[PDB]
Amino acid sequence: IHTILYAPNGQDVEIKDYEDPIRDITGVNGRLHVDCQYSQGRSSATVQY
Amino acid sequence: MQLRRSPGMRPMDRDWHQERARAREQAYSSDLTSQFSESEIVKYELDTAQIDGSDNPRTYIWNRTIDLFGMNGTDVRELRNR
């Protein structure tokens, strides 16, 4: 089972601070690109109630 | 003989330039009669200055009645996308 992480500005989560150029507002914004894929789904079993 | 007011000499007067620069900066419209003295319009040839309010900074500065966000005094021609 693969978790695939992509980030344009590094390896991992990117957090950016900013001021609004006009409005006396400050913010913080996080991003990360993620997918998850089985290489072999047969390698896995759920347990059911 | 030429005098500083005489029509062929106006372009050499520093003050004719400086006052035409003022007139462009203080106007809101090409309507000179409303905004200037007859004396100023004649002395500085304001008919021939490209006065239209496009050079006045107050055309572009925001001045809203209520200012919750510090928006007042911002000038649109200083923004990122200008």
**CA pseudo-torsion sign B52, B56, B57, B63:** negative
Q: State how far the Cα of A9 lies from the Cα of B36, in Å rounded to an integer.
A: 57
- End-to-end Cα separation, chain A, in angstroms: 24
Q: What angle do CA B35, B40, B41 make, to 5 degrees?
A: 75
**A22 interaction partners in chain B (CB closer than 8 Å):** 69, 71, 74, 79
DSSP A29: E
Joined together, the tokens standing for residue A49 give 């109630």
The contacts of residue B42 (CB under 8 Å, 6+ apart) are none
Q: How far is CA A35 from CA A7, A38, B47, in A?
A: 12, 10, 68
Interface of B with A in 53-82 (CB under 8 A): 69-71, 74, 79-80
Q: How far is CA B11 from CA A29, A43, B2, B22, in A?
A: 57, 90, 13, 16
> Which structural technique was applied?
cryo-EM
Q: Alpha carbon A12 to chain centroid distance?
A: 8
Resolution, expressed in angstroms to one decimal? 2.7
Q: How far is CA B29 from CA B7, B20, B32, B39, B66, in A?
A: 25, 14, 8, 18, 26
Best of B60, B62, B68, B69 to disrupt the A interface (most A CBs within 10 Å) is B69
Identify which of A20, A5, A34 has the alpha carbon closest to the alpha carbon of residue B69.
A20
Joined together, the tokens standing for residue A5 give 């992480």
